[PDB]
Amino acid sequence: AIDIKAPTFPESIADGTVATWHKKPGEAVKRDELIVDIETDKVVMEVLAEADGVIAEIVKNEGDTVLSGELLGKLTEGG
Numbered sequence: 001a002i003d004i005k006a007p008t009f010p011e012s013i014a015d016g017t018v019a020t021w022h023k024k025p026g027e028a029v030k031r032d033e034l035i036v037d038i039e040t041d042k043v044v045m046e047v048l049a050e051a052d053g054v055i056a057e058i059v060k061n062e063g064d065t066v067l068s069g070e071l072l073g074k075l076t077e078g079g
Contacts, residue, residue: 001056001077004047006038006070013041015065018072025055025073036072053078 006016019037029035029049036047036058054076060066 002050002075004036004072004074006066006068006072007040007045008068010041015067016040016070017065018060018062019044021058021062023055025057027055029053029055038066051078 017039019039031051035049038045056074058073060072
């Protein structure tokens with residue numbers, strides 16, 4: 001499957017913060033559709049799905065911080 005982890009932060013920043021979980025784990029998704037945003041130093045990035053399937057579960061909650069290699073959730077097998 002595909003495990004989703006947090007991005008790497010520079011020196012000034014030693015962590016990050018989730019942005020907003022548009023959808024939730026346990027629903028349907030479609031490639032080319034936003035899935036979760038991320039918060040960086042001072043810029044909000046976006047995370048789109050690279051293929052439909054079934055999410056597993058999100059361990060981090062919106063408004064929380066995420067460390068490098070932080071597992072935010074995992075993808076399930078499709079088909």
